[PDB]
Design a protein around this ligand. Sequence first.
Ligand SMILES: Nc1nc2c(ncn2[C@@H]2O[C@H](COP(=O)(O)OP(=O)(O)OP(=O)(O)O)[C@@H](O)[C@H]2O)c(=O)[nH]1
Ligand SMILES: Nc1nc2c(ncn2[C@@H]2O[C@H](COP(=O)(O)OP(=O)(O)OP(=O)(O)O)[C@@H](O)[C@H]2O)c(=O)[nH]1
Ligand SMILES: COc1cc([C@@H]2c3cc4c(cc3[C@H](O)[C@H]3COC(=O)C23)OCO4)cc(OC)c1OC
Ligand SMILES: COc1cc([C@@H]2c3cc4c(cc3[C@H](O)[C@H]3COC(=O)[C@H]23)OCO4)cc(OC)c1OC
Ligand SMILES: Nc1nc2c(ncn2[C@@H]2O[C@H](COP(=O)(O)OP(=O)(O)O)[C@@H](O)[C@H]2O)c(=O)[nH]1
Ligand SMILES: Nc1nc2c(ncn2[C@@H]2O[C@H](COP(=O)(O)OP(=O)(O)O)[C@@H](O)[C@H]2O)c(=O)[nH]1
Ligand SMILES: [Mg+2]
Lengths: 134, 433, 430, 426, 422
Amino acid sequence: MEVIELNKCTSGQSFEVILKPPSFDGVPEFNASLPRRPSLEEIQKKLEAAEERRKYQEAELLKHLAEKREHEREVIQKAIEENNNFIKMAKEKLAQKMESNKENREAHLAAMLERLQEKDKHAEEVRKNKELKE
Amino acid sequence: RECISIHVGQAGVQIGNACWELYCLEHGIQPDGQMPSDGDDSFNTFFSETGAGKHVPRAVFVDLEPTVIDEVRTGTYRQLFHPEQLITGKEDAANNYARGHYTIGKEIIDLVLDRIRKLADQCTGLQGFSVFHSFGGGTGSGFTSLLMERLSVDYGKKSKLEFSIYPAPQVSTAVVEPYNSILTTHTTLEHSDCAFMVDNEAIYDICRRNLDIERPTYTNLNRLIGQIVSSITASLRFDGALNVDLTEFQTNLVPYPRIHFPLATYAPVISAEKAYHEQLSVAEITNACFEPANQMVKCDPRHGKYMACCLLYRGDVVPKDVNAAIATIKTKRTIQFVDWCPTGFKVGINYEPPTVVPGGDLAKVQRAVCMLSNTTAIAEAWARLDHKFDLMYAKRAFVHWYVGEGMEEGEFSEAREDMAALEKDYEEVGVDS
Amino acid sequence: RECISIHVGQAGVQIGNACWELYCLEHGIQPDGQMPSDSFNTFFSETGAGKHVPRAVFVDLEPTVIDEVRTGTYRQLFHPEQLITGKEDAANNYARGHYTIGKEIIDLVLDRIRKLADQCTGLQGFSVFHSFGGGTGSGFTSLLMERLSVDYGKKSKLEFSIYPAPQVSTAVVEPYNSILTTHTTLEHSDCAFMVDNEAIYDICRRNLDIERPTYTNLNRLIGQIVSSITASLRFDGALNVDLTEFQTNLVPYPRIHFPLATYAPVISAEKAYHEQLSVAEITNACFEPANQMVKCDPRHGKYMACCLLYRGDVVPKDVNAAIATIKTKRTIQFVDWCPTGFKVGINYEPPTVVPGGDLAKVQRAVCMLSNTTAIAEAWARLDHKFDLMYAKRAFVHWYVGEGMEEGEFSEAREDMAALEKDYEEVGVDS
Amino acid sequence: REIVHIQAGQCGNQIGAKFWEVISDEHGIDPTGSYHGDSDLQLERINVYYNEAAGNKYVPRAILVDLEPGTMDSVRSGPFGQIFRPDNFVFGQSGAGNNWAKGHYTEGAELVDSVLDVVRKESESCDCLQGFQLTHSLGGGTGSGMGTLLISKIREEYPDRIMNTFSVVPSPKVSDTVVEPYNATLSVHQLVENTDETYCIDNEALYDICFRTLKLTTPTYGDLNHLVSATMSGVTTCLRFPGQLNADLRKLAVNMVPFPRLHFFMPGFAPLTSRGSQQYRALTVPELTQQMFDAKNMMAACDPRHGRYLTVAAVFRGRMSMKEVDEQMLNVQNKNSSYFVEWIPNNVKTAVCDIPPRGLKMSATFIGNSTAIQELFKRISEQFTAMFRRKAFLHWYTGEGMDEMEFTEAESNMNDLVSEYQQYQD
Amino acid sequence: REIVHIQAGQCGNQIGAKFWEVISDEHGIDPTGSYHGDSDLQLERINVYYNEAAGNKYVPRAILVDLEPGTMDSVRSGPFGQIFRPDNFVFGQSGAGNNWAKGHYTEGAELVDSVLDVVRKESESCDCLQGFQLTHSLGGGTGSGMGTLLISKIREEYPDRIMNTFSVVPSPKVSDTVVEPYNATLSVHQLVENTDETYCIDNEALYDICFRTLKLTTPTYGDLNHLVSATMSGVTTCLRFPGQLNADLRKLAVNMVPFPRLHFFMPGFAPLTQYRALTVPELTQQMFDAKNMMAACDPRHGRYLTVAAVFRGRMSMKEVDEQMLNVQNKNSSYFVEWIPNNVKTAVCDIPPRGLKMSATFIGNSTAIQELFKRISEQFTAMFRRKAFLHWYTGEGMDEMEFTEAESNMNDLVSEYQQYQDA
Ligand SMILES: Nc1nc2c(ncn2[C@@H]2O[C@H](COP(=O)(O)OP(=O)(O)OP(=O)(O)O)[C@@H](O)[C@H]2O)c(=O)[nH]1
Ligand SMILES: Nc1nc2c(ncn2[C@@H]2O[C@H](COP(=O)(O)OP(=O)(O)OP(=O)(O)O)[C@@H](O)[C@H]2O)c(=O)[nH]1
Ligand SMILES: COc1cc([C@@H]2c3cc4c(cc3[C@H](O)[C@H]3COC(=O)C23)OCO4)cc(OC)c1OC
Ligand SMILES: COc1cc([C@@H]2c3cc4c(cc3[C@H](O)[C@H]3COC(=O)[C@H]23)OCO4)cc(OC)c1OC
Ligand SMILES: Nc1nc2c(ncn2[C@@H]2O[C@H](COP(=O)(O)OP(=O)(O)O)[C@@H](O)[C@H]2O)c(=O)[nH]1
Ligand SMILES: Nc1nc2c(ncn2[C@@H]2O[C@H](COP(=O)(O)OP(=O)(O)O)[C@@H](O)[C@H]2O)c(=O)[nH]1
Ligand SMILES: [Mg+2]
């Protein structure tokens, strides 16, 4: 059975009941590893290359967005452009149809007036044919 | 010689707050002033005797919101620290390791790393830090690891002891908890010398059978951990063999590099109201020591083998008994000691009776015990955790929240793949040829 | 916000005159002065410190009609400035208005109307009332409309067109005139209310029981419809009404689509005490080929947007139960691709009718504006008329005479060809 | 708008005078005086036919033209003589005429300006002009030749404003001369080219109605004229009267004529004749229409039947009901649906007016563009075509200074017109 | 942290007003006045929702936006009118809208900056910002189009901070316009891409609860709204109130959403529309009900991803923790096993309205797809033969822009549908 007394102090005492010894000749080696990672202050620069990714994502989806943003500015613009752009057409094809009207009637007029004018250089040029028979 | 408590992380903090409480009660410290009561130190194990009245711990609290820390600066104990030992990060709680260890952590790591040296600058030969933190949960999953990285760079020799709180489906916080523990405990494991898991589903569960509260209050739980923690330390705040100085903590508990997380078990937890029935058999406290239900990490070492064993007593107790009580423990036992490790049984009686908090839940105990054992079975809990993780990650679950704050997915496969190693490591020790 | 009535054209004028009348009766306006007994500002500007005055323009190219406005009460209700009279040569051909005699007055009109929308903190549009056929409102109307669009690009425009009916109509040349205007006109109108007399007249037979229909008679009836049509935006404008939603809500496609109109309980005095008309019936009678507005039937055509404007003591709980029951006893016919329109517009305000009148005290009335393919049917009966005259240059040379190209004709009718296919084209899809 | 009136040529003159005095006492005007009919209507439009000078008085916008004194001094002394303003008479002094040539060339141009100018001062006076109606005789000179010139000089000074005539196309029966064809066919050429509308009163129907259906044995020039007069009242009605339509003459063109070639309307009246009875009143309205759309009741020698109707306008006058009329009119265009161009959808419109003509409590009248009218042209041509053949009386114009080819060129204008009307029976 | 609030678009506005006045008198605020409830709690966090100016007074950090006067002056004159700070109203004058296009392009950008800026002066004022919650109408223009722009401009000036909305997805029954689909599907595209979390209140459930299970025959816009209002109280609870958790909105994202594609929560309320005896079994049962969800949707036809539920009153987590569990068993099937603890539950000692016992529910469930598939279905069939479309073509949009938003949606569906797996 035996104990084995390990220290004696102002406020305590220790020991050991070793009860039956192991079945030993030492043994294992379970991640008690011969290359096993003593680590390194240099890998603050591992903390950085993670935060250069954030600065990324932000800056390239604030890019995938001032992108959107500045299409908007061009839609509301292609609508001041749609409108402005049809005033200038059916506003102008208005008066264009109106020179075709004052001009065409200018004809069917002074060309109706034309007949009734050599009906007249005939009244008076065959009254100077009154000077014929008599 | 000396000893700095670091409590990062909301849980850590409250736990701290509530075991610092118990420290005092035990050593005779009115919140503000001196032990003024009718060799040269002994209680200096933790505290530095500043001013010419004051007693003050060697402590640091870090959290990344105020909220929790403030309460420390509100209610008595508010006088017991320096405002300087009380680092508050006013900024953005978190809830992902990605947050702490990287994004928001980067910010405060310097101011912290500072103060703590500033603190070990008083100290004729520090020993190491005991660091208390939540397993899952933003900044103490996250930040805890970052702290620990740097710590080891700055204090190469000086050893480090984590008190981890392993999170419990019912009295827990967030979905992402698994990812977070598994994350931390991967990075963290190569830098800690020994680590005390505490599972809530065990504490909570104790506060049911023992404290008989349908209730468990956060505070409730804490005073209980608070207690164990007292018993855990305190070998080295009182000085009396059975381990004092951190190096006696690996020396007596971890046989292998891989941080092994001892299993904890406090003795007689018993409610007031019931406080006068006492006289608990110096045998029973022991017998009830080896009790699946009276554990600390929900599991059982009937299933696993033992590879180092350790009783810390506290009270009127001459060894002649303990011994007779060990004897009788062994023959009514599935004792299960593994193969190659004769029979640990370092016994640390500690004379000093174990004051409990006066409002309290537990009462006057004239004898208590503690039992720290490293057993293969502590793995069972690692499995429960992994499997959660395993099964979320199987669908990138929440992943992109961490990737978002700026991680490689590959930290994940490469971390869980470390548990894979440990879980084998563990079962591997098991019953040899 | 605000809203300028333009009445070009002898029909439009009288119609105007006789729904402006109804406006007043409804809002409380003694011809001269105040309601001495915003929201009503939807149409009117509260000038001086007494008199209420509309946002109105009347244009015709002879006096005669307009003068009667400056003769009998209401003669106090306009400015003499809102009342443009063109003293010169009526017309009876689109070629007249849109070109010859129109050219003259287009400026003075185009003027006054801006002058009018110069008061107006953010105008909305104009509703323009005009005859389909007939000199200066076939013609000029189109001219007005061209220019308007040039000066008020956004600001939308709504025509109230009177589609002419072989019996209570004027001149042979009417077809030519509508088909002419409605071609030019259609590019510039955002939605347009056809009203066919052969349906109004026809209503004043089954309903008003007069062997008679007087011009005035018809008018007060259209007048009524028009009240219910508008007035969503005159009365319930205690705040947020704004066209583009009479709009948005009715025409699904560029092509101006002329919704179909249908007033609810038309019923004579003498018979005014039999009342209590089933909140269900006014709806059931709403879907009534005989009770329509444009002579045709949507049993034949599909529906592509539907709209009920009630007016009277009515909680929706009914209307709804009355829709349901409208659904199942129906060749309902909702086209393919336009899940079921049924914007319901209860308007609380009871529908005052003219005191001498024909119709009487109605405690509940409905309106139903629907765009249906079938409204085409009427475009066909018109075209065909035209088609068959033009087949022999019929009266052509009277327009050519005032200075048109024949090609305006083939190129106009050929737009109806487009529209008439457009219409049928929407019909029942795959 | 507002219209002025030219009344030239002995016939054209009596026609217009007997016109003027019939319409005048429709509106209640005294030989000079003003109104004397305590019925209100009348005056709205008195407008269109009367410029009104100092004090009361009413004076017609009318111009009197002839190439021999006599026939004006028959209005001046006589009926409503004292009505017309004196510088509005244009006596010719001169040789009569009775050959187109005379009145369109020689003694014609002699006057032109004197008249052409008083017309200007009356139309320039008037507010917004409509056009002119001229009444004249299509056979025999002064007003067959003068009037046709007049227009060919009006039109030219007034090409905007429109052009109207009542032309009396002469017969072989109670005609005067065997030159008539020449004159008609010379005018009728002119006519076709510069009137926007003309009414043909053919004396043939005018005689035929008087004796063949009106008991009268020796037809006066008067008991004959009163016919045309009464027709002319009822043809102008609408532009003279109430609220319904009012008819801008323009309106009455581009509604009556499908084709530039001015297509002349045969009119037709309702109940008829002198004085000695058929004021039965009981002219039921069926009975009115029936009698109105009748061969033996048209104003031109022509029986619709042998010609379809292009477009037709009929106005009723009195105390009745469009209740029956709109109903009656329709049973015509069915029990006659055949002859009535289908390619002109609504070719028949119908007006009512509450104020009777003459005696009559019920009375209608009819304006009719019908291919039927050709019948009448083909006839003048027939007499002409057979005369100018072996160039009969012609050397009678050769002399006043005309060309041979000018007859043929007018002849085959006519002979086209026929062959276009005949073409539109399609 | 600390949050500010954007309340834009006539619906979004009444929603937020009927909200503000419900929550305000939870904390005991007078039309201007301060505190008037000698119960202590309330104020710890009064913080998160109210910046507080001179003297007593309390003023909400709220911004009001519309493109037509009217609907604000309906708050200004009315309920808690006198509360909001005047240079915080941003009236539009302008054409209404009622086409997304209007409120995202033309009359939209017209205002943007005026609002965008007041938002800045309030968020730069606040101590450490949380993010923003915007309340708006997903169908019809000003705030379907404006609000969607607003965010797509917030995000951009505030990429760190997080993005919340209460969106009212419209129906065919008590909706107004035959364009709704178009507007929704346009916003819904936007939504998916720049909110970190959105709540869907579908008017269809909102109606269906009102009449189908609440006796009410003609559903007001009011007796309807009070529903959404109440829901919103009980959804924010935690970030407004006591010690337990407190919820950094953040915390409420990376706990509610496994997947970037922002997955919108259907809410669910407890008792609605005063027996008291709402035993707590009786509460849960009614809460996790089809006929009681805030989106037209009956979980059943969709598993739950992650779900959060808070109770309110004096009861016991003694029964509740016990009751919640007997749900996730008598329902264990529909409840993703691949997210271990997907259901957490909170208690709080201060009742809403009337109610001595009342809970509420936050729900990320693949079930929600049901609702999207529907707007798509009306849309997909409308934009088909390009129906009313030429109405936006005009305010200056692209044909392909619809398809490109249509097949964003129609993806979303086919992802939710994809995550019924394991
Ligand atoms: N045993 C115990 N566990 C706690 C306590 N407080 C929190 N926890 C647990 O710790 C885990 C999460 O850690 P937290 O401290 O809550 O979070 P944190 O990252 O450290 O701090 P925050 O930034 O505030 O989120 C959860 O499983 C909780 O159950 C406590 O007082 N006692
Ligand atoms: N419904 C209705 N139709 C009318 C009215 N007055 C005229 N019309 C019709 O309108 C069509 C012709 O339009 P009008 O107003 O008469 O002529 P206008 O060109 O506008 O004016 P004018 O120059 O006088 O000819 C005809 O079909 C008539 O039936 C009316 O008061 N009510
Ligand atoms: C002045 O003379 C008249 C003129 C008109 C013509 C007329 C002529 C038509 C016609 C219509 C019309 C149209 O209703 C009228 C409007 O103005 C007129 O001048 C008309 O269809 C076929 O022929 C119609 C008339 O009434 C029948 C009339 O009476 C004398
Ligand atoms: C502000 O809103 C809330 C947020 C949270 C979420 C939440 C959500 C969860 C969850 C957990 C949690 C976690 O405990 C919380 C901590 O902070 C939070 O916001 C949380 O598991 C599944 O879903 C939990 C809440 O209570 C149910 C809550 O109440 C409204
Ligand atoms: N009906 C009508 N016709 C007339 C009248 N007088 C003459 N005519 C006809 O007109 C023709 C001649 O016209 P007339 O006026 O005598 O010639 P003018 O005066 O010199 O132009 C004759 O053939 C007659 O038939 C008249 O009184 N009334
Ligand atoms: N439930 C809720 N929805 C509303 C309310 N008002 C309108 N809506 C819905 O939202 C849609 C229109 O939103 P609305 O606010 O009118 O448009 P906007 O203000 O111009 O953005 C309609 O389909 C309604 O169903 C409201 O009072 N409450
Ligand atoms: Mg006209």
